């Protein structure tokens, strides 16, 4: 509630709960290694 940022990107997609753990910096997996890639120093929030 108390910060300012230049831009905020909201990405959405539909996956299974097994692959939810793959959404995290530095992870590997089918979704991670073919569908959606995160930076090592990622700053943000993950909601599912």
């Amino acid at each position, epitope marked *: 509630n108390d910060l300012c940022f230049t831009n905020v990107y909201a990405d959405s997609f539909v996956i299974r709960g*097994d692959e939810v753990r793959q959404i995290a910096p530095g992870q*590997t997996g*089918k979704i991670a*290694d*073919y569908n959606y890639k995160l930076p090592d120093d990622f700053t943000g929030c993950v909601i599912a």
Partner: antibody
Amino acid sequence: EVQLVESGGGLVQPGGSLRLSCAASEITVSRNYMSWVRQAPGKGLEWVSVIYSGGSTFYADSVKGRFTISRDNSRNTLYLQMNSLRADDTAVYYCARDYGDFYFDYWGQGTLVTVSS
Amino acid sequence: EIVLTQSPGTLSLSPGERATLSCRASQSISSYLAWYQQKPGQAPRLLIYGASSRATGIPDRFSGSGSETDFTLTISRLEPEDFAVYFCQQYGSSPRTFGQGTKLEIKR
């Protein structure tokens, strides 16, 4: 048609090391998911590891940091090294390819691995 | 780790009839099993895609059946070429596992 030809394996005393290899007749290996599994008698198959088409790897928990996997795209050959071979792991190991979510479709002739003092 | 159970312990039957291979898992899944054949001393061969999709190199006599946790394999009109052992492996996630095997015998 598509064939996998392996070699290697064998017997070394506990604490030893062993590298294995396998080549493919027609499937290039480079653009394919490749995996390793082993069979111990009266105990069955067992997962070991696999390589994804993106070059990433993963292994079973019991062998993490111990069992290694590599490829040579130039020769359509699969390379596996094993270190810290332990007891009761003596078995036949196989090379395998998938389509979809790890459907081991084509299989090699299998390679025996043995460990004992 | 999810464990499978193949049943029965052994299969003994005459050719030309129907085969029934049942399998159970520890934890309930949805169409995440398959079948693997092996004539002894040979290369194991992939049988059935998912619960009921058959590979192209495999004749029509085979049929697979699956559920949440119970899964059964069915083959009809048994033939001599069919004498072998039969295995279940999980194409779901855990990471993947397998079953204990079951042997088919052709009776004259």
